[PDB]
Structure 1
Amino acid sequence: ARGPKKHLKRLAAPHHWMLDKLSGCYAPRPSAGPHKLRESLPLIVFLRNRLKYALNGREVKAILMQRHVKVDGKVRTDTTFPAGFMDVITLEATNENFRLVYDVKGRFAVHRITDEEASYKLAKVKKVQLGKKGIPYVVTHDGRTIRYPDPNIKVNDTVKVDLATGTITDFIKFDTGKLVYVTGGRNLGRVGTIVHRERHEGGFDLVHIKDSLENTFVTRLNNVFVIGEPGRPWISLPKGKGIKLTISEERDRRRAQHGL
């Protein structure tokens, strides 16, 4: 290819958009935006598929055009906008508010979350740098560039953007014994506590995570998103809280909780 690629064939779309392998040759390629397309979620997928509020492409276009979708307090009238992790989608119709958090199967689950907390958003600090005229600034995972941050905010840390002014409200410092979320690999959706963070001089940090069920795994640091203090998450965790029940345990859940 000579230049950028602008088509996403259906099989090549991520298995987390988890579309239908039939009924279409192509899949919505997310336009450039705040999130990686492999990690993001187009608005058309979130509305037509996840919510079923629409039926097809024209309906999603009509929905977005009339300015009822509000991604993080902004309209975002483009069909393939990459609404990524921890973004907030507001529909004044049905007065509903969603926050995108992976369900433990590892998918962008529909999370109806309250209006009061929908005012703010969480973010991971991916860079802390000194821009022109000696002005410190911080780059989050959304690509948001927050100017004049707290002087002791470091990389891999987490922050609580007020999402109205777009400035820093509070922040959480990365360290052991801290509630944490996972955003990549087999451990998608898993939530736990940081037990240890082995350094590995030369690259590719690893952290060990122990969840409430007392199960333990290990994940890359790029893959990690501190979410609060144990017992006190800073957001509303989805149904199941990412315990990753075993397949037999899931079968027992299906058998036990069963009413028809």
Structure 2
Amino acid sequence: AKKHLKRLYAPKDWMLSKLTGVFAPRPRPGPHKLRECLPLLVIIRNRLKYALNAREGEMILRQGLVHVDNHPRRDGKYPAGFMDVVEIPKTGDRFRLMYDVKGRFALVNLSEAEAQIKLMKVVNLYTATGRVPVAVTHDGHRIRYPDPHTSIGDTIVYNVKEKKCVDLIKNRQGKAVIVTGGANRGRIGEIVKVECHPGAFNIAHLKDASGAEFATRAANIFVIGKDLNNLQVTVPKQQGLRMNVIQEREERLIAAEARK
């Protein structure tokens, strides 16, 4: 099977320079999809800058100094992804892997009693041997006894340290969601309606805080709160609000001139 990953073929969100190397670290199979993940080596070397190169990254990772969802992960090819909690106890670092308004990965700093909570979107529900209902989540977790009201597309806020479900947010109109894929990835809005096309892709029509209306496929939405006012997780700085490109360029130019 494929063991390598050309740097040109690597996801653009990893921000690896096309001139520095032929290859990029190929994510191993695991919790998240290869195209929708951030490798641990990329996090430790290119984002956190704790490692100058891969050899120092190996030094840090093999010692189990980096924890993902309250578990040391020693593989630099481990596929960390959305809503994962990454903690380095030695440096006192705690952040959640999320998407900013531009669709890039963002390390949102977390406090204690916040790093113990992780949201998981239910992608499948089946019955195991012994008539045991099992819920499969977006990060590959299998839950042996979910809430009876759990449905596919819902989100389970899950205590990683105690390994137990603590609450469930249903996937209904009026709920706050974050887009996890497509051109609208990273936007935060409220479900206005969901159009159902059986045998095809359901379309979710959303509306952000400023009132902008956008759409995507139902697979790309991720419920994160009862409504936009009360979210169940800390979001990045820009709060999932897409901002006009012309206005953004003008504000950056003014801010740059104010600095100098």
Taking structure 2 as the reference length, the TM-score comes to 0.96
Kept after mapping to 2: 8 A contact 1:86/1:100: yes
The DSSP-based 3-state class of the residue aligned with 1:94 is coil
Q: What is the identity percentage for the equivalent residue pairs of Structure 1 and Structure 2?
A: 49
2:86 is equivalent to residue 100 of structure 1 = no
Quote the RMSD (CA, aligned, Å).
1.0
Is 1:124 matched with 2:114? no
Query: Please, which of 159, 164, 177 is the counterpart of residue 162 of structure 1?
Result: 159
The SS at the match of 2:36 is coil
Distance 1:253 1:209 in 2: 27
Does the aligned pair in 2 maintain the 1:146–1:166 contact within 8 Å?
no
Question: 2:68 touches 2:85 (CA, 8 Å); kept in 1?
Answer: yes
2:236 corresponding residue in structure 1: 238
Q: What does the per-residue CA deviation read over 1:70-109, in whole Å, with 9 as the maximum and x for residues that have no partner?
A: 0000001011110110000001122110100011111111
Contact 1:51 1:110 in 2 (8 A): no
Give the aligned length.
257
Cα deviation code 1:181-200 (max 9, x no counterpart): 00111011111000010011
SS in 2 for 1:160: strand
1:37 counterpart residue number: 34
Any conservation in 1 of the 2:133–2:146 contact (CA below 8 Å)?
yes
Pairs within 5 Å for 1:54-65: 54-65=51-62
Give the letter for the 1:192 counterpart.
G
Name 1:197's counterpart in structure 2: 194
Deviation larger for 184-193 or 108-117: 108-117
Amino acid aligned to 2:47? R
Q: Say whether residues 1:87 and 2:84 are aligned partners.
A: yes
Q: Please, which runs of 5 or more residues in structure 2 have no aligned partner?
A: none
Runs of 4+ in 1 over 3 A off after TM superposition: 255-258
Equivalence for 2:226:
229
Q: Deviations over 1:226-258 (max 9, x none)?
A: 010220110111100121111112113213444
